[PDB]
Amino acid sequence: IYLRDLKVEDIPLARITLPDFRLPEIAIPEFIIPTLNLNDFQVPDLHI
Amino acid sequence: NGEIQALELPQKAEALKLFLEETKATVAVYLESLQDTKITLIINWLQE
Numbered sequence A: 001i002y003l004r005d006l007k008v009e010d011i012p013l014a015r016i017t018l019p020d021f022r023l024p025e026i027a028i029p030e031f032i033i034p035t036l037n038l039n040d041f042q043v044p045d046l047h048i
Numbered sequence B: 001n002g003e004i005q006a007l008e009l010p011q012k013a014e015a016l017k018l019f020l021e022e023t024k025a026t027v028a029v030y031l032e033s034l035q036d037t038k039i040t041l042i043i044n045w046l047q048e
Helices: B001-005 B008-032 B038-047
Strands: none
Touching: B001 B008
16 A cells, blocks of 8 residues: 655665775975076176 | 884874774674665564
């Protein structure tokens, strides 16, 4: 007499465990500015 | 980098991730035990 259709059976969480909510390791993005050299292009020939 | 490695930050992050995953697995098991994925298990609840 009771109804036979449910929606709990459609949910994977209610069927299988899901160890979600993971934490990435505490690291740091190391990015160094390049060494820009310009004395090789122009040479000051004027005495100051 | 030396200060990060001195405070075992990656190890603490890994331990927290593992503990969170364990808690999520336990919560999923508890929810599966509580929620009824079948009509009859609900009807049997009436018997209680």
